[PDB]
Design a protein around this nucleic acid. Structure first.
Lengths: 254, 124, 190, 41
RNA sequence: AAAUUUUCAGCAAUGGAUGUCUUGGCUCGCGCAACGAUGAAGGACGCAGCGAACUGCGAAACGCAAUGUGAAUUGCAGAAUUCAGUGAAUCAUCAGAUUUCUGAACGCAAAUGGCACCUUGGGGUAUUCUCCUUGGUACGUCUGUUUCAGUGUCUUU
RNA sequence: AGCAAUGAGUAGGAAGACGUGGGGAUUGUGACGAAGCGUUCGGCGUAAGCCUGCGUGGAACAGUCUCUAGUGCAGAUCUUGGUGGUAGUAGCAAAUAUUCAAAUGAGAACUUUGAAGACUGAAGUGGAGAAGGGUUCCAUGUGAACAGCAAUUGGACAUGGGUUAGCCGGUCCUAAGCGACAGCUUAACUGCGUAUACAGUACCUCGUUUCGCGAAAGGGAAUCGGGUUAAUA
RNA sequence: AAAUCGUUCGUCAAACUUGGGUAUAGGGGCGAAAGACUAAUCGAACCAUCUAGUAGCUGGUUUCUUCCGAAGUUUCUCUCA
RNA sequence: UUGAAACACGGACCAAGGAGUCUAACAUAUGUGCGAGUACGGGUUUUACUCCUGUAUGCGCAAUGAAAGUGAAGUAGGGAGAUUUUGCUUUGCCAUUCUUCGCACCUACGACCGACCACGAUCUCUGAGAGAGGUUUGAGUUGGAGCAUAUCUGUUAGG
RNA sequence: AGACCUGAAAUCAGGCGAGGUUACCCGCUGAACUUAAGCAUAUUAUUAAGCGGAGGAGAAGAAAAUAACUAUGAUUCCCUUAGUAACGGCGAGUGAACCGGGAUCAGCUCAAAGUGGAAAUCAACUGCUCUGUUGACUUGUAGCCUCGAGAGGCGUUACCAGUGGAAGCGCAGGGUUAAGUUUCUUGGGAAAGAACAUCAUAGAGGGUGAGAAUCCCGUCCUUCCCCUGCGUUUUUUGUUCCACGUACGGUACGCUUUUAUAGAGUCGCGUUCAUCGGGAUUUGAGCGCAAAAUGUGUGGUAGGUUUCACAUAAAGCUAAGUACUGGCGCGAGACCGAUAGCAAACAAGUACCGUGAGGGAAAGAUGAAAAGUUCUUUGGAAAGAGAGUUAAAAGUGCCUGAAAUUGCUGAAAAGGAAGCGAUUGGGACCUUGAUUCCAAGAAGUGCCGCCGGUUUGCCAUCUAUCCCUUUGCCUUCUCUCUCUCACCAGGUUUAGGCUUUGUCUUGAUGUAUUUCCGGUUCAUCUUUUUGGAGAGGUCAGCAUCAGCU
């Protein structure tokens, strides 16, 4: 916000009618600034100066927040959505689960060689391509020098030094499973990040989110996973089954 | 990064470097050593001093060498013997180079500068 | 809308709200560093709120009662050392509210281990616990240790004679219209 | 006078030399130590 | 047809937009409690080898002592010693000193270095003389002290 | 995709696009040349606009989907800055007036020296002070600018130098008046302020005025001659 | 020259002219009285603030196409801009 | 402005700057979540994000009287759609041809609740109450829809 | 003459006050613009300006309180009550409190009595590690007491002063920590590109001749560790570890008895004025009246009679949570980018204007490095011209260098405006054997095949759990007005290890297929140069039809 009294710290008045100028208020006395003239003047106020009380934050509802994270976690599976939004050529499976001996790994040396084996080498290159470029626009003055891509998101049950290992690798984030933020899972309002679950972390997801098909989901009290308006997701299976298609007419032209 | 009282702002970093008290500059203008001297002392770096031999690795004068003459800390510079250019009028001037680019051939040793190296080499 | 005064002066914003949380939270921890073994707050009684719409509920009170501490046999003097609130204003009008808080105090003094001041053991002033000494956990907080749960449920009952008979509109509806016309009755009586 | 804030601005603490005051932050940082010296090592 | 006027382009002029910068602003958050009769804030006048200002400082005057770091500063000059050092620096730190004339401002004053008195130590027919020299002398108010005043209330020599 | 009918429009309403500064995601360009700028090399779109050759330039920018706003100008006797026509135009005409030679200089209607000729005409354009100014005083030097033409000149510019008191003034006194004491008002700020216990270590005997400010023309201790310096007497 | 210049003209020993010092300050002063003068400001000075005072009244109000497209009449109004 | 090429006013030229914004209280509309429900602190944490959570409260689930108080049986008509059947190019085309059930919603009238007015068999008679009303009246009711959030538009307060 | 009492003096001895700062805080004093579409009550507002006083916070504070309940229990702050009760030309507008849920929690001591076998007390000055000499003081200083009781009476048990040492925390100033400057291309310069390495608890940020994790400072490790000095556990913004201590005193607790008893020109009331949502008075103030002791005050409508409940006024202290455009020191940013952002990115509250109160600007950018153009030549000099530095003059208000405006050159046009629309033309100037097809040759390319190594698995089979279908359960969870109920058990929801029962994959068979080198050479198609066969493009002419005319 812009300083309250910027523009208006001056004893100006209108000269007014009769002296063959505009009626705008002018600086009195005798400087160069003396005689000089609002919204529109040099050294004027801004129109509607930006107050601090502008409401910055939104409350989103807790149920809509949970439905969102579930939907974003669904998009972690399906190489349709992960390839669409990454390089998934060498990757053996999605969702890419690994054992709980990952949790004990301390050094970055070891936590690079793991991701070469699992085959994230192509998408750990594309962050290093975008690592060095100065960002377009005036954000370079203001701390934001650089605009990297987003890599693997490792997801873990408890910290025994994974947070040490994986952090310094360029553009790969960590995320504890209790606190699944949407802002890492679906970056840029866009589904389906490439993740890398620990085995215990993958297991705990059922204790959080629950059963899908009426009782609730244990840890989130009173919560159930969402249900679509359809059961079967598609048309073409339903439309081109024998129960529909016999009753359907023979088509037409023009 | 992971510590309050350490700023990653661009203004504060630049002002701190530029205002530079003279005592602080001494650490900023450091020079790396030869791979001969890294075997002896086991240190990566050292603050430049007036009476040091030295060799220029980058820039226009690469693989020139000589004794340092001057340490113009107000400009972040050193001068060297020989490394010069003539003006219009045929009268010689020492070229300034930055001591990150230069590399130390062999150092001076006082009591203090020698007992700096023992203080550095507790790590290595 | 009430914005005819110069209201821009007195706008309170809440950008501190998370910074306030974390400043409170630092001094709770730095309190409990000094205490360590000793639990934090102090013990408070069970208390019915006053007026008729919160009369059912129970909450925590301010502090106990000089009558209540006499039953268990604390002094009102010493009780703040152990960590029991005294409240010298609150009476016990009922027998029921008395015996709730006396149970609550006696259960707490069963929990209470009390260390020797050193070197030797010294009785009274509950007691000196010797160097036998079962493992105390650290500061528990005292509210979370001994909490207050709206205890529900009714025993399902046989419908008696003179249960179906008595007409509970007319019983209430007398009790109103008696209580209005009390002095009006005593003229007509006398 | 509070009717002129620019008038106050021109003539207040810090506009001048501050001979006694400038040294105060450093002095209070060390809790006003008195009648001592720095030791030779 | 020249010349002139107008139009379009090229080159030159005039002018400082656009673009890219940024040791500055602005806003939010978090900590801390420290001015003054032991003379404050603010003012005036001075001080650098060669400076007007701005910063710094006060006749010890861009500083002195101490501590730390350990070789510069720099526009030029000089100093070179200060170079295995009881030590370079427009260095850092700062616990010891200096701190003119002022200002609540305090001997009276004040568009005046004006006009007094007391006092220390010394300098020139004298106890009273003039001179230099050291430090004083405002107001309110508390506790104590000393000296008083009152046909205030009392005894009484 | 096909068929048919329809198509004016201020104030006003709604719909789909174009463009600008930042945030998130993604795809890229760039010291073998980014942004911006210029252009009869051009092209596309009904249009807002977009793409692009060549030249200059020298360090960062763009496409796509979203989020966000200090987001689009011909006008406000709008604001700030810059520039024209008017125009080599209005004009530089009060205070009687200059001329000739030589010297100096790059250069002389204008500087200096001489010779002539005028004016001021002692209630002077002369010789000295105050107020106000503050180094303009004096000397030597000079590339600009300034001195409404010029300039070798200068109150301009630069580097130096210059103001000497017992007797000349201030200082001392009191005027109209004005600050404070005792107190008196008022929440204080202020306002009033003549009320009061203010000589012959020791011994007496006197004792009515309260301290200060207020005149460089009032009052008042004492100075005159001649000489002297680039500038003081 | 934000009141000047020329010729003419009024008074000229007084209810005269004038320097310095001093007193009177804003709904207050001062006035041989004109509402004159009070720093080029006067039928209520100047400076800052409350203050971005209020305005049924003027003047402005920044891209393109596409589709629909008015009213100046009713009643009440310190209502007739 | 009824009417401007006007003898109506603003506009010498160019650049840059320049005017429906932000907060609050409501309201309709629309998108999303959950649905008789719905959404200050503490606990975690890499520390303004995120995640979890106890106890209340908000608005809603019942209105009506100034108040003391008291406090809720459907029917008919038209109707979406389904079903049974009658006309035409044919295994599909539109009928109103049928009787069957008739959603929403509108139209007509009821019953029940509160207020007002006017009664009252009989009881445990300051009261209760079978029963039966009224050209009166409510923002009532009739097997509940709301709450939170996002954006636009409007009203109002604030420069 | 001597005791007091009262009032002075002193440059007496030793102390304390004054003034400054503005963000927050305490007290007085006190407007109008404005809204009401006028205006006067009302509103703005118990606000601005004015005059006092503080502190790290301040004020407030342990009920002369709320209530009418199964009752609560200092104060402050947050959420809520609530835009409610109430006020209001009942117009415009205004507007709290209790309960509830949280942060935070802490209580206390004077007066009213009692040393009277004996001022036990306090200050100043001097004297050894706590004596003496003056004074204050009986017109009352210590001890005791503060309504939660207190005081005697009786009777028992139990408590209360500490020294040691080890560790450790806080504050200030210092000190030390990983890995390439490896080869080639471009360039003034490599920090860019390509290839090959390395470190990572460090790939924040900055510097260095252009995008630097590895050249340098830093960053992580680190609220670490190591010096030097302060403070600290005794004096802790609430308590740390073992070791070893004690009762002269003093304080608790139990039974019983009880009246030594609680703040006056104050409370209260009548009036006047202000203030409040507070209405026949919320709170305050002036004046007048002026209390009481089984009393007094309050219980939101004036009044009297009779009950009930709640508090103990007129004396006082008190941390925390809370506030914070100032000072001091840090960390951030969907903020501004030199007409913006503070007035001020620079010798900015500066230059400058005003007698004065006050007013108050403009002004950032050569280059990596001054290498800032010596030297010859013209000129009085300033400059010009050669030559020179640089990657470049980028040539000192020097990055880029728009428009308005100005000069020249070229190109047109012009009989008292010019521009403009639509339509052609003229002059300058710009722009275009297709696509292929068949032989031969070279330059590419290097598929399958054939081996070694490697990875997929059509199809026929056998089979898992997904899912529901419950079964036999058992274990751990979770919900529940399910049971004697205090605990176990039973249903509900999850997970797991097991079970009976009927189109997203394992394990064998090998249709097929990728990658990998040596090949073993061959296909293929690409561009091209030599023939052979083949021409699109554009604008027209005539012809035949289909529509309209």
């Amino acid at each position: 916000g812009v300083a309250p009294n910027a523009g208006y710290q001056t004893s100006a008045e209108s000269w007014g009618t009769g002296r063959a100028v505009s009626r705008i208020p002018r600086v009195p006395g005798g400087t160069h600034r003396a005689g000089q003239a609002g919204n529109m003047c040099r050294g004027g106020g801004m129109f509607a100066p930006n107050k601090t009380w502008r409401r910055w934050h939104r409350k989103v509802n807790v149920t809509q927040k949970r439905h969102a994270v579930a939907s974003a976690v669904a998009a972690t599976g399906l190489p349709a959505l992960v390839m669409a939004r990454h390089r998934i050529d060498e990757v053996p499976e999605l969702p890419l689960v690994v054992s709980e001996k990952l949790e004990k790994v301390s050094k970055t040396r070891e936590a690079v060689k793991i991701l070469e084996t699992l085959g994230c080498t192509a998408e750990l290159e594309r962050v290093r391509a975008s690592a060095k470029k100065l960002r377009a626009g005036k954000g370079k003055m203001r701390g934001r020098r650089t605009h990297m891509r987003r890599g693997p998101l490792v997801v873990y049950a408890e910290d025994n030094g994974v947070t040490r290992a994986f952090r310094n690798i360029p553009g790969v984030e960590l995320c504890k499973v209790d606190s699944l933020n949407l802002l890492q899972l679906a970056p840029g309002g866009a589904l389906g990040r490439f993740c890398l679950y620990t085995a215990s972390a993958f297991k705990r997801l059922q204790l959080l989110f629950g059963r899908h098909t009426t009782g609730t989901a244990q840890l989130k009290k009173g919560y159930h996973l969402p249900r679509a308006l359809m059961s079967n997701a598609d048309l073409s299976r339903i439309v081109n089954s024998e129960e529909i298609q016999r009753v359907v007419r023979p088509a037409r032209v023009a | 990064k992971f510590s309050s009282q350490v700023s990653s702002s661009r203004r504060k970093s630049r002002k701190a470097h530029f205002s530079a008290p003279s005592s602080v500059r001494r650490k900023i203008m450091t020079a790396p050593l030869c791979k001969e001297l890294r075997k002896k002392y086991n240190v990566r770096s050292l603050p430049i001093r007036k009476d040091d031999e030295v060799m220029v690795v980058r820039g226009h004068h690469h693989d020139r060498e000589g004794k340092v003459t001057k340490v113009y800390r107000k400009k972040w510079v050193i001068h060297i013997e020989r490394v010069t250019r003539d003006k219009a009028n045929g009268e010689t001037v020492t070229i300034g180079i930055h001591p990150s680019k230069v590399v130390i051939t062999k150092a001076k040793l006082d009591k203090d500068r020698k007992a700096l190296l023992e203080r550095k080499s507790r790590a290595t | 809308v009430h914005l005819h005064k110069w209201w821009q002066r007195y706008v309170k914003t809440w950008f501190n709200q998370p910074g306030r949380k974390q400043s409170r939270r630092l001094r709770r921890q730095e309190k409990a560093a000094k205490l360590g073994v000793v639990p934090s707050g102090l013990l408070r009684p069970i208390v019915h709120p006053p007026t008729q719409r919160y009369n059912l509920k129970v909450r925590a009170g301010r502090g106990f009662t000089l009558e209540e501490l006499k039953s268990v046999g604390l002094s009102p003097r010493v009780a703040l050392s152990i960590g029991v609130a005294v409240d010298h204003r609150r009476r016990n009008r009922s027998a029921e509210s008395l015996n709730a808080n006396v149970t609550r105090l006696k259960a707490y003094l069963a929990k209470l281990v009390l260390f020797q001041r050193g070197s030797k053991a010294k009785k009274g002033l509950p007691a000196d616990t010797p160097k036998s000494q079962i493992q105390n956990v650290k500061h528990v907080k005292i509210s979370t240790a001994m909490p207050i749960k709206a205890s529900k449920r009714c025993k399902p009952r046989a419908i008696t004679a003179e249960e179906q008979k008595f007409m509970a509109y007319a019983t209430l509806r007398k009790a109103l219209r008696d209580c209005k016309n009390v002095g009006k009755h005593e003229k007509k009586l006398a | 006078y509070n009717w002129s804030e620019k008038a106050k601005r021109r003539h207040t603490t810090g506009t001048g030399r501050c001979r006694h005051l400038k040294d105060m932050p450093r002095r209070a940082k060390n809790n006003f130590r008195e009648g001592t010296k720095a030791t030779p090592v």
